[PDB]
Amino acid sequence: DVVMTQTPLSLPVSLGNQASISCRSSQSLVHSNGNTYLHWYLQKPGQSPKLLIYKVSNRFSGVPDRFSGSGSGTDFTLKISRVEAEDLGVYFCSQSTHVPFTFGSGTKLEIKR
Amino acid sequence: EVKLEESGGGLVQPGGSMKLSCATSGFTFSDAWMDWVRQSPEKGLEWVAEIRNKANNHATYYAESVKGRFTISRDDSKRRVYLQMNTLRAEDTGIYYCTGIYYHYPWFAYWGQGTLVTVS
Known part of the structure; x- marks a missing residue:
C-alpha cells in the first residue's frame, strides 16, 4: 500500500500566525489520467474526518481561502494562514490515486502561548 | 445532502463477533461502491x-488484516451497507466509519459519524 507520512504530529502555533504541514507519499500520486489525488481531511474531537482540500489544492465547500494546499509527485504541503481557533483539530493527508486509499498519521494544530 | 450513519458498535470479547450497519441517503446507492474505514x-x-x-457483481475486497474474518455486504433495496466481524482481535478496536465512492468526488468524500468498537 502507498504509505503516507506527515510531520509534525503536533503543531503549536500562535493565533494569527502561519502553520505549514508536510506530507510525503511512498510513491508518486500522479494518476494515469494525469491528475493528482492527494487530499486533506480535518477532524474535530468526537467527529469524523471532514474533507478540507482535495486534489492537492481545491478547497472543499465552505473552506476558507486561508487554507492552501501545494506540492507534487510525492511531496505536499498544507499551509494555514493566519490561524484561528476554528482551525483547531487534527489534519490528515490522504491519497486516492492508488487502491487501497491510505492516510497519514495526522497533525494536531494547537494554539501555543 | 449526502448522509451516512453507522450503528452497532460496542464492547466485545476477543474471539467474539459483532455486526455493524450503515444507513444512507442523498445519493444513488445502487451506483455507489461502498466501504468501511476504521x-x-x-x-x-x-x-x-x-x-x-x-x-460489478457486488464484488468484495478486504484489507489483509481482516480477510477471512470480516464480511461486507449491502442491501440495495434498503440503501444500507453492513460489516459482519468475526473472531475479533484487540487489534480490531477503533472507530468504524462507512463511506464510499461518489460521482462528483470519486473518493471517500463523505463519512458517517462513526461507531466505536472496543475489543476487551
Whole structure:
C-alpha cells in the first residue's frame, strides 16, 4: 500500500500566525489520467474526518481561502494562514490515486502561548 | 445532502463477533461502491473493506488484516451497507466509519459519524 507520512504530529502555533504541514507519499500520486489525488481531511474531537482540500489544492465547500494546499509527485504541503481557533483539530493527508486509499498519521494544530 | 450513519458498535470479547450497519441517503446507492474505514488507536485511519455495485457483481475486497474474518455486504433495496466481524482481535478496536465512492468526488468524500468498537 502507498504509505503516507506527515510531520509534525503536533503543531503549536500562535493565533494569527502561519502553520505549514508536510506530507510525503511512498510513491508518486500522479494518476494515469494525469491528475493528482492527494487530499486533506480535518477532524474535530468526537467527529469524523471532514474533507478540507482535495486534489492537492481545491478547497472543499465552505473552506476558507486561508487554507492552501501545494506540492507534487510525492511531496505536499498544507499551509494555514493566519490561524484561528476554528482551525483547531487534527489534519490528515490522504491519497486516492492508488487502491487501497491510505492516510497519514495526522497533525494536531494547537494554539501555543 | 449526502448522509451516512453507522450503528452497532460496542464492547466485545476477543474471539467474539459483532455486526455493524450503515444507513444512507442523498445519493444513488445502487451506483455507489461502498466501504468501511476504521480509525485504530494503534494504526490510525485505515481502509477495511469494499463492496462494488451490482454491475460489478457486488464484488468484495478486504484489507489483509481482516480477510477471512470480516464480511461486507449491502442491501440495495434498503440503501444500507453492513460489516459482519468475526473472531475479533484487540487489534480490531477503533472507530468504524462507512463511506464510499461518489460521482462528483470519486473518493471517500463523505463519512458517517462513526461507531466505536472496543475489543476487551
